[PDB]
């Protein structure tokens, strides 16, 4: 709806889409993927690569959470599950 307990700019935004930041360490760039708190990690590496479109290092691709120094390989859980969001900047490296 919109209420959600807040209002709309924050109680809606438009659809609850927040692009997750991705600091590519293998490129040193920073990309953002328009996602929601329901996309599986394996869902992010897919899109980010889709934008690439090249026989580049695709297997050497995996997201890590420096706020946790982890390796986001839990395709079962999601962002919300762990608590990730736009305030969480991930990276795209092996």
């Amino acid at each position: 709806m919109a209420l959600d307990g807040i209002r709309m700019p924050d109680g809606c935004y438009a659809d609850g889409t927040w692009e997750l930041s991705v600091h590519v360490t293998d490129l040193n760039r920073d990309v953002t993927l328009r996602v929601t708190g329901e996309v599986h990690i394996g869902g992010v590496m897919l899109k980010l690569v889709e934008k690439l479109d090249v026989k580049k290092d695709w297997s050497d691709h995996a997201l890590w959470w420096e706020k946790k120094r982890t390796w986001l390989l839990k395709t079962h859980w999601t962002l919300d599950k762990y608590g990730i969001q736009a305030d969480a900047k991930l990276q795209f490296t092996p």
Binding site: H40, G42, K55, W58, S59, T75
Partner: protein, 65 residues
């Protein structure tokens, strides 16, 4: 001028000397028919796909499971 042949990779039409994948009866360079995650190797026995993009199951499953 040896004689060791193999199997032309349909689409490439060049003998496949080593490993050879088979399709609708066509052959394929085990490489030119890899998974699009880790483009190094795929197998018609474990070749998964989505949106037309090849994938190893372990690769595709990792995406949508």
């Amino acid at each position: 001028y040896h004689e060791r042949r193999g199997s032309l990779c349909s689409g490439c039409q060049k003998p496949i000397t080593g490993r050879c994948i088979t399709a609708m009866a066509k052959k394929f360079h085990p490489e030119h028919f890899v998974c699009a995650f880790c483009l190094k190797q795929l197998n018609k026995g474990t070749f998964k796909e989505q949106n037309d993009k090849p994938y190893c199951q372990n690769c595709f499953l990792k995406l949508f499971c």
